[PDB]
């Protein structure tokens, strides 16, 4: 009767589980107060609950190296040691890890304080937020679009540029050093599986799906772009090409990573009365708390429990008056032990009723995997949470849910018009920010796989706005600048290609949740609510963790392993069908080498 | 003919950790469960063996009352049969349980911002605990295949760890107050009545 090597490990992470649930909610609530309540009293607090919570993560990490996953035989194990033994940062040496996180802070508050002045005025400047992003979301004046645009991308890129060399130096060498080939192989990682039969997924196994599923996207982006190019060539006659790029500052934002804006420029039928429920609201007298009521209804609707009497008490719902300062933006907080929060300041309004449908689901999501040990309370992979955010937001936004809610009047008329109206925005917000996603971090695997020297990195990273996006820039860029850097996910080390996953995900959740529904229709219409069958289908996967594969997660909500983009085409197809009548007139697709400048 | 002590037990200053549970003889006395029984604060007034309203109408040989601390989903365990955690490491109800266990909220007065880390429970021993049993014992348990002489350290831990109480946790983290009314009757003097 010795101990296995699995034995040691199982009380080991059984030790380690309760010491990390007290001291992550000793961080997490240090975090909270520092959110809700700014002093640089709680300031120190959240940067000191935060070290001893580091300090523990270093500590259990380097004790759990001493029990070897080679000798284990239990996934649920096997998956808490191998989250365990990531050294990460630590696997470099303590100059290098110093300088590491020197880089990167000083690119993050490079990116957050980078400011331009105007050629007129050196001391009335912009930072990036809320001026220049303004001009680049509202402005109609081409010139005062591309000084935002080249501004922005030549005072603060050009900064950031040496620092992002070095950060690909030494990222490269922590990723070397923790088993990978590239650190673009690390990120990576988070969609690995082995050892599951018939479930295992590797990591070059993202490249090649991520590059199938955006093949067959490419014909409705295709339409979706020569429609766009032809609205804005009617917008601004004598500055695009009915065969060029689009060019990447008329956009409607700062990078071009969503098309939102360009609705108003790119409309189908103006005439047609838009949705906005915001006046219905105030026009019942709806609240905050009224607004996360709808919502805990909704929830509740499905099958799945009601907030938390915690949840209620301790979340923040509404801008704590101008007598204290907080970070306002929503955050869904599974702070542990039982204790959800949300974090918003909510105004009465239809963008903030949809966001808090996303964020209650965050916090569903949160509570369903809450019996999960604790290395193991996560969504499926990186792009589980936020998929299941959005199609909340989804079944939330419908006419049918709207006018079930009394927000809206049961006399009002959906129409082919009204409706194409709304799967033109979707699209300029879903399908435009799909070839910007996949570019972008086709270029940084690129990058850090060695693929891409420095003394190309601008051109090939322009070369691929042209060839991908159908994005032209208008101005030339040398080797100073920097402009993958200039977007804050670039300057602030976050994965990207969630964005691409997490937006296939959700539909290949709502298709199978409506069909849970017996939904009639089109997909894009379909309002789950009132449908156990759905909620007991979602909760399923809910429940899992990431405890399970991801594979085996995503098959129990849809009954497929893998990601696939033919529900994203259905939910489109109407759009799709539209697009290609109103581009038989109009060239389909873009040549890469015009341009505004040459 | 004067009322059992009760409050004594149940409203006294502070609660028995559940891995040294402690036990009061409740005998040679009469018993104001009678009127106990709708305090009406109880998230968990459950008999497992006797009516609840009649236990008046019987005496019994000798009552043990045994207090404690868990939190909700701890509860769940104070049961018979039940082996969560605690109800095989700390406090375990025979099979042929006979009495009831009773269990209120303590957030209030258990509780502290900044963990009251004074209650503890056993997490790791080498055995399920006999019905009944107690064990007080901090020997250092021995996970691993080396000795560990009152070391604290690779695959050797303190047995007893402490529940970070502090009132936001969530209504299953919260601490719990329970007692149980251990009702034995057999031909030893019968002196507990109501
Ligand atoms: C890997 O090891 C873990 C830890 O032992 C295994 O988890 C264990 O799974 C079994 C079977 O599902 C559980 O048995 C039962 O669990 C319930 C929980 O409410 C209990 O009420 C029953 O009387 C019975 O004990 C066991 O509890 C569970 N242990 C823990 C700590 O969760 C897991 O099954 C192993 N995986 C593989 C693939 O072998
Ligand atoms: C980061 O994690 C890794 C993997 O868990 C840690 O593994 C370490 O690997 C070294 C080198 O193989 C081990 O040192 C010794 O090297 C000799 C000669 O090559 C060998 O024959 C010994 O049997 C032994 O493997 C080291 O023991 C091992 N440590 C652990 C905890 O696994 C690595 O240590 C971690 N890195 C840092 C900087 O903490
Ligand atoms: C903010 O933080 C401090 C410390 O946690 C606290 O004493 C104070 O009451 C909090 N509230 C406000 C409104 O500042
Ligand atoms: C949630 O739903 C149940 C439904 O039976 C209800 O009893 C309960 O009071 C509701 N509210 C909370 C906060 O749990
Ligand atoms: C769900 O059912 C209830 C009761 O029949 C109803 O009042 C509510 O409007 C329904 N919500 C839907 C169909 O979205
Ligand atoms: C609206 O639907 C009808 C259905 O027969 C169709 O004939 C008509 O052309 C549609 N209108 C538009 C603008 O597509």
Excluded at chain 1, 76 to 89: D, E, H, R
Excluded at chain 1, 365 to 374: E, L, V
Aim: aromatic share 14%; net charge negative.
């Amino acid at each position: 009767d010795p101990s296995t090597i699995e034995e040691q490990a199982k009380t080991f992470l059984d030790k380690f589980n309760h010491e990390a649930e007290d001291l992550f909610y000793q961080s997490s609530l240090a975090s909270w107060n520092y959110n809700t309540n700014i002093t640089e009293e709680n300031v120190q607090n959240m940067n000191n609950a935060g070290d001893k919570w580091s300090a523990f993560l270093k500590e259990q990490s380097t004790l759990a190296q001493m029990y070897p996953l080679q000798e284990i035989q239990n996934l649920t194990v096997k998956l808490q040691l191998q989250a365990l033994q990531q050294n990460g940062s630590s696997v470099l040496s303590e100059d290098k890890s110093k300088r590491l996180n020197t880089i990167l802070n000083t690119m993050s508050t490079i990116y957050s304080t980078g400011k331009v002045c105007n050629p007129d005025n050196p001391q009335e400047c912009l930072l990036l937020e809320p001026g220049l992003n303004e001009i680049m979301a509202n402005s109609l004046d081409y010139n005062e679009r591309l000084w935002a645009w080249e501004s922005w991308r030549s005072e603060v890129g050009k900064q950031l540029r040496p620092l992002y060399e070095e950060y690909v130096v030494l990222k490269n060498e922590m990723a070397r050093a923790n088993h990978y080939e590239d650190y673009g192989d690390y990120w990576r990682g988070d969609y690995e599986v082995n050892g599951v039969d018939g479930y295992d997924y590797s990591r070059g196994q993202l490249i090649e799906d991520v590059e199938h599923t955006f093949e067959e996207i490419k014909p409705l982006y295709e339409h979706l772009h020569a429609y766009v190019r032809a609205k804005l060539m009617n917008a601004y006659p004598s500055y695009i090409s009915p065969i060029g790029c689009l060019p990447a500052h008329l956009l409607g934002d700062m990078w071009g990573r969503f098309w939102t804006n360009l609705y108003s420029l790119t409309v189908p039928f103006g005439q047609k009365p838009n949705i906005d429920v915001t006046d219905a609201m105030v026009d019942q007298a709806w609240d905050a708390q009224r607004i996360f009521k709808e919502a805990e209804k909704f929830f509740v609707s499905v099958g799945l429990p009601n907030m938390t009497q915690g949840f209620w008490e301790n979340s923040m719902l509404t801008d704590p008056g101008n007598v204290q300062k907080a970070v306002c933006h929503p955050t869904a907080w599974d702070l542990g032990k039982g204790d959800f929060r949300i974090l918003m300041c909510t105004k009465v309004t239809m963008d903030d009723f949809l966001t808090a449908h996303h964020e209650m689901g965050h916090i569903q999501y949160d509570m369903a995997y809450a019996a999960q040990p604790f290395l193991l309370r996560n969504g499926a992979n990186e792009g589980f949470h936020e998929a299941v955010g959005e199609i909340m937001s989804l079944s939330a936004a419908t006419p049918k849910h709207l006018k079930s809610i009394g927000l809206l009047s049961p006399d009002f008329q959906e129409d082919n018009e009204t409706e194409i109206n709304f799967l033109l925005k979707q699209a300029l917000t879903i399908v435009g920010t799909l070839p910007f996603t996949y570019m972008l971090e086709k270029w940084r695997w690129m990058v850090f796989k060695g693929e891409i020297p420095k003394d190309q990195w601008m051109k090939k990273w322009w070369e691929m706005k042209r060839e991908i996006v159908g994005v032209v820039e208008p101005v030339p860029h040398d080797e100073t600048y920097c402009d993958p850097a200039s977007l804050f996910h670039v300057s602030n080390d976050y994965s990207f290609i969630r964005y691409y996953t997490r937006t296939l995900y959700q539909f290949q959740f709502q298709e199978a949740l409506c069909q849970a529904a017996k939904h009639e229709g089109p997909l894009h219409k379909c309002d789950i609510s009132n449908s156990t069958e759905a909620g007991q289908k979602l909760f399923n996967m809910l429940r899992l963790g990431k405890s399970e594969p991801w594979t085996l997660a995503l098959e129990n909500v849809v009954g497929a392993k893998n990601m696939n983009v033919r529900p994203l085409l259905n939910y489109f197809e109407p759009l799709f069908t539209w697009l290609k009548d109103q581009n038989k007139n109009s060239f389909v697709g873009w040549s890469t080498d015009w341009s505004p400048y040459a | 003919t004067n009322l059992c002590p009760f409050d004594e037990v149940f409203n006294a200053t502070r609660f028995a950790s559940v891995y040294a549970w402690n036990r009061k003889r409740i005998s040679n006395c009469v018993a104001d469960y009678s009127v106990l029984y709708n305090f009406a604060p109880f998230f968990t007034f459950k008999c497992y063996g006797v009516s609840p309203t009649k236990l008046n109408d019987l005496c019994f040989t000798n009552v043990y009352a045994d207090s404690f601390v868990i939190r909700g989903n701890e509860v769940s365990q104070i049961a018979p049969g039940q082996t969560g955690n605690i109800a095989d490491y700390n406090y375990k109800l025979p099979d042929d349980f006979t009495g009831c266990v009773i269990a209120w909220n303590s957030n209030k007065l258990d509780s502290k911002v900044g963990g009251n880390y004074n209650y503890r429970y056993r997490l790791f021993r080498k055995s399920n605990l006999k019905p009944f049993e107690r064990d007080i014992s901090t020997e250092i348990y021995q996970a691993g295949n080396k000795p560990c002489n009152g070391v604290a350290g690779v695959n050797c831990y303190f047995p007893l760890q402490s529940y970070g109480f502090r009132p936001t946790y969530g209504v299953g983290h919260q601490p719990y107050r329970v007692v149980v009314l251990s009702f034995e009757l057999l031909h030893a003097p019968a002196t507990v009545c109501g």
